[PDB]
JSON list of C-alpha atoms in Angstrom, two decimals:
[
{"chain": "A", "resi": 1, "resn": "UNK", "atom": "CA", "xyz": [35.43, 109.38, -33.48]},
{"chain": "A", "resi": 2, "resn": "UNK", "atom": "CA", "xyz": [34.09, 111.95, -30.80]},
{"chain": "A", "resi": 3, "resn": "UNK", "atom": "CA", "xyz": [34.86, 112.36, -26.94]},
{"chain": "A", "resi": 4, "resn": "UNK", "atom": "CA", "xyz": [34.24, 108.52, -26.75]},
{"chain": "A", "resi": 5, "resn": "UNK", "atom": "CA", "xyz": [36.37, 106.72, -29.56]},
{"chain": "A", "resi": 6, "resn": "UNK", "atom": "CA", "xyz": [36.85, 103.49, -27.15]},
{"chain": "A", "resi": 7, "resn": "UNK", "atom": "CA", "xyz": [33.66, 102.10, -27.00]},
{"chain": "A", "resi": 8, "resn": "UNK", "atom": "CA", "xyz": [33.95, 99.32, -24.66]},
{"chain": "A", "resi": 9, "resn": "UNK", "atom": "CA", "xyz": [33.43, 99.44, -20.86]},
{"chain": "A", "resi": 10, "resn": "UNK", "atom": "CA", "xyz": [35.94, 102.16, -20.95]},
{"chain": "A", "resi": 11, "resn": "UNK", "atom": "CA", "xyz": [32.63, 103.69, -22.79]},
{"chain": "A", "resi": 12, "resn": "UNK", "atom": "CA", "xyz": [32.35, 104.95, -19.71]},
{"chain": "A", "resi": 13, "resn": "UNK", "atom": "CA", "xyz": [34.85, 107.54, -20.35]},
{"chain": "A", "resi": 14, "resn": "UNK", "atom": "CA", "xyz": [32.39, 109.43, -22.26]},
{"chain": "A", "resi": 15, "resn": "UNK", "atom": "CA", "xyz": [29.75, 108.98, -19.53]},
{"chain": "A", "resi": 16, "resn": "UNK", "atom": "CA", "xyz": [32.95, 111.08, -18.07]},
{"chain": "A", "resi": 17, "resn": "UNK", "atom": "CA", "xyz": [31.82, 113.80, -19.94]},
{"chain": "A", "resi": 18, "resn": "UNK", "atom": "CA", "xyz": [28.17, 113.40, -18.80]},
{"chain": "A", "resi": 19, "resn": "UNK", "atom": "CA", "xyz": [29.77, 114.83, -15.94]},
{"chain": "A", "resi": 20, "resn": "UNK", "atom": "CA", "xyz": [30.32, 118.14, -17.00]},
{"chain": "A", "resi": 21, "resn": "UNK", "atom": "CA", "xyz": [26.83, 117.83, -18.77]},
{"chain": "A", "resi": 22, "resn": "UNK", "atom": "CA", "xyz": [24.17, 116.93, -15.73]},
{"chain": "A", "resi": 23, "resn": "UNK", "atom": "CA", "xyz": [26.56, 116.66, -12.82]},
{"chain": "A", "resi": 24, "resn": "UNK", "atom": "CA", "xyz": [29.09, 114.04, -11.40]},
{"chain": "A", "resi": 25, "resn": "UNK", "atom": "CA", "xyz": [26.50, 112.00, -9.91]},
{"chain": "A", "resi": 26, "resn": "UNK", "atom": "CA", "xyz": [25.91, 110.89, -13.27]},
{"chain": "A", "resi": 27, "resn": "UNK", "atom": "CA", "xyz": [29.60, 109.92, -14.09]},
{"chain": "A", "resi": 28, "resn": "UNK", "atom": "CA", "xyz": [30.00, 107.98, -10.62]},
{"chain": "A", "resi": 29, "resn": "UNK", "atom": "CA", "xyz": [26.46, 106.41, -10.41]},
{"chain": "A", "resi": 30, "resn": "UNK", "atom": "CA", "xyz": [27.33, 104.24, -12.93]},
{"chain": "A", "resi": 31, "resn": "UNK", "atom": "CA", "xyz": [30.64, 103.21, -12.66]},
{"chain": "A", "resi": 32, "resn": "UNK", "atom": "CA", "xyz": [30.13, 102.83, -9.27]},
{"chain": "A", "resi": 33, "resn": "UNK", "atom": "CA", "xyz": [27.21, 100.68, -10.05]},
{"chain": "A", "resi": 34, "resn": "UNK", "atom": "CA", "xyz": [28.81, 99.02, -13.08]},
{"chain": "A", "resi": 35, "resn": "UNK", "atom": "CA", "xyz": [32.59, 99.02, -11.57]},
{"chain": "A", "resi": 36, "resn": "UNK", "atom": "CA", "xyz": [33.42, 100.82, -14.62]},
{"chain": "A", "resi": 37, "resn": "UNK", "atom": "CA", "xyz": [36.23, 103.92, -15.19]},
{"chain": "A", "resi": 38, "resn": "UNK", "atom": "CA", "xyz": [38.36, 102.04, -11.99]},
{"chain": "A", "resi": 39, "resn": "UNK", "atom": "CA", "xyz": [35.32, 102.07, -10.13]},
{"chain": "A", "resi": 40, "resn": "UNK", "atom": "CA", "xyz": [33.99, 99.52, -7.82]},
{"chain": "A", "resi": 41, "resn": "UNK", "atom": "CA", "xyz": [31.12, 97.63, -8.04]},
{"chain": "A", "resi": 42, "resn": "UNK", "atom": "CA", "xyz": [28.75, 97.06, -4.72]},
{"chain": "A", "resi": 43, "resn": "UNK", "atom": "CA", "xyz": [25.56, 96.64, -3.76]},
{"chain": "A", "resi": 44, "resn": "UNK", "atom": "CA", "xyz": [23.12, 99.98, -3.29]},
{"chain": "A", "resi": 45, "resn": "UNK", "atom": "CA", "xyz": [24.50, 100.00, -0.06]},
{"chain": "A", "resi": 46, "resn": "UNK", "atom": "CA", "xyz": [27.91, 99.87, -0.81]},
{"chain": "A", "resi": 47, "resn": "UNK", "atom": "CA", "xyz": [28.00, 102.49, -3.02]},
{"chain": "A", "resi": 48, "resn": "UNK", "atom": "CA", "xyz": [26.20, 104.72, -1.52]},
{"chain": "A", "resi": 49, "resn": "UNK", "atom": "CA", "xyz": [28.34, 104.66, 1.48]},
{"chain": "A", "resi": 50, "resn": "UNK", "atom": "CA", "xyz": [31.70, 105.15, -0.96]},
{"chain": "A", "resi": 51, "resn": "UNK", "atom": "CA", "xyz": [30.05, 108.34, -2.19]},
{"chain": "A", "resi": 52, "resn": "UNK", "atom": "CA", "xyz": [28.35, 109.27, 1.25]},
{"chain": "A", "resi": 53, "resn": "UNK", "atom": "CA", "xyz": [25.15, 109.06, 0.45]},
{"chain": "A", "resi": 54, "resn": "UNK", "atom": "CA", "xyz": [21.90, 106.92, 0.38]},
{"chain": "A", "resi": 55, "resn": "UNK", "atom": "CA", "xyz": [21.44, 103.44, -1.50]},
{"chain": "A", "resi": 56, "resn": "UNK", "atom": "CA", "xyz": [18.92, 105.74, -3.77]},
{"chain": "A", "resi": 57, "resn": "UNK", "atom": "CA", "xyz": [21.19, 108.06, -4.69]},
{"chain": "A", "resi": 58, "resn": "UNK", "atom": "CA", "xyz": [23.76, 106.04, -6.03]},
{"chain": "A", "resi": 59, "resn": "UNK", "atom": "CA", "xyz": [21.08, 103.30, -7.81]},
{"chain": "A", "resi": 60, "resn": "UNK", "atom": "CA", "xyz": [18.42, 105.19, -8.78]},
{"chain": "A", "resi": 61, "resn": "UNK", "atom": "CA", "xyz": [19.63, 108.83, -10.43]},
{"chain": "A", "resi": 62, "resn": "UNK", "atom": "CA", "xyz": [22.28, 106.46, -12.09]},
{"chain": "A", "resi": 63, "resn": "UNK", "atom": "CA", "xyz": [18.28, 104.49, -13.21]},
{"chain": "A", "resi": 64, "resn": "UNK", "atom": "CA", "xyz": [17.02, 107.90, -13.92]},
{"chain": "A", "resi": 65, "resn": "UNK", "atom": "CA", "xyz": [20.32, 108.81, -15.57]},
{"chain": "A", "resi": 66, "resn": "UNK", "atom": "CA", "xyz": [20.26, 105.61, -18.04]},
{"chain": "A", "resi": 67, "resn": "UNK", "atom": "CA", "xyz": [17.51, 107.97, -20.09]},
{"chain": "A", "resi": 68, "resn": "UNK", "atom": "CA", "xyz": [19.32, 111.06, -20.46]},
{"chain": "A", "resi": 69, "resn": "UNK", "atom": "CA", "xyz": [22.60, 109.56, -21.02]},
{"chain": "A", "resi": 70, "resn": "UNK", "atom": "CA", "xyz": [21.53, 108.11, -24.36]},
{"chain": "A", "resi": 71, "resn": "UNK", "atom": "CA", "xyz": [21.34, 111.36, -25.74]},
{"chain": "A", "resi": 72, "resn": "UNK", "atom": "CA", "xyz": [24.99, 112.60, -25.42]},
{"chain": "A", "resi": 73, "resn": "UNK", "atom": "CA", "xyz": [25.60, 108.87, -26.81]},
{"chain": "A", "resi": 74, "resn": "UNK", "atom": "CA", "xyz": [23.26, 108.86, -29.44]},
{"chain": "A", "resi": 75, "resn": "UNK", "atom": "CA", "xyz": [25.12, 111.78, -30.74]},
{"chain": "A", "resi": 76, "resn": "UNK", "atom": "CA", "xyz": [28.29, 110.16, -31.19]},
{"chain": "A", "resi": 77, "resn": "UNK", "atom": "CA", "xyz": [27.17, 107.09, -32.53]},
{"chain": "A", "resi": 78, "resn": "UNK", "atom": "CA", "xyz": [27.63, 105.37, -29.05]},
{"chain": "A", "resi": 79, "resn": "UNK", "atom": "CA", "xyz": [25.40, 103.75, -26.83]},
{"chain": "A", "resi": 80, "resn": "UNK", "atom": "CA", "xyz": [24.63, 103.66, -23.18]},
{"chain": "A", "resi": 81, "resn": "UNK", "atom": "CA", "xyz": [23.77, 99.93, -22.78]},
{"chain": "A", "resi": 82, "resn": "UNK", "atom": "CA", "xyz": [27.40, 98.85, -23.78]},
{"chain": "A", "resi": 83, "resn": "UNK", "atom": "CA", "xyz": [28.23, 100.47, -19.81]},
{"chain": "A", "resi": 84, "resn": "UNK", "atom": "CA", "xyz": [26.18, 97.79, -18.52]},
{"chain": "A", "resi": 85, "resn": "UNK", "atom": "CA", "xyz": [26.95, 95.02, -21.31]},
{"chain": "A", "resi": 86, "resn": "UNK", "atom": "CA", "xyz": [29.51, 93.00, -19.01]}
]
C-alpha cells in the first residue's frame, strides 16, 4: 500500500523513511545490525566502526529505535519485527 508495499526484509525500505523521520541513525542502526537494505551485518563492534562510532551507538539507539519505529509501521499496516524476522 503506503511507502512500504514490500514487506519483507526489504521492509526495511520503509525504516528508509524513518530516516527522514528521527534521523539516519535510525535507518542504518538496523540494517547495519540486521544486514538489511544491502547492509552488513557485524557484531556491535563492527558496526560501529563502519559508521564511525561506538558499539552503543550502532546497537543500542537501533534498541531504543525498535519502540518508535513501530509507530510509522503501525500506520501502514506494517510491522517492525519482520526487520529482524530472518
Amino acid at each position: 500500500g503506503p511507502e512500504d508495499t514490500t514487506q519483507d526484509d526489504d521492509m526495511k525500505q520503509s525504516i528508509v523513511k524513518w530516516l527522514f523521520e528521527l534521523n539516519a541513525k535510525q535507518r542504518e542502526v538496523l540494517a547495519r545490525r540486521f544486514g538489511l537494505l544491502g547492509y552488513e551485518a557485524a557484531t556491535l563492534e563492527d558496526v560501529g566502526r563502519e559508521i564511525g562510532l561506538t558499539r552503543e551507538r550502532v546497537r543500542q539507539i537501533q534498541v531504543e529505535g525498535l519502540r518508535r519505529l513501530r509507530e510509522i509501521l503501525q500506520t501502514q499496516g506494517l510491522n517492525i519485527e519482520a526487520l529482524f524476522r530472518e
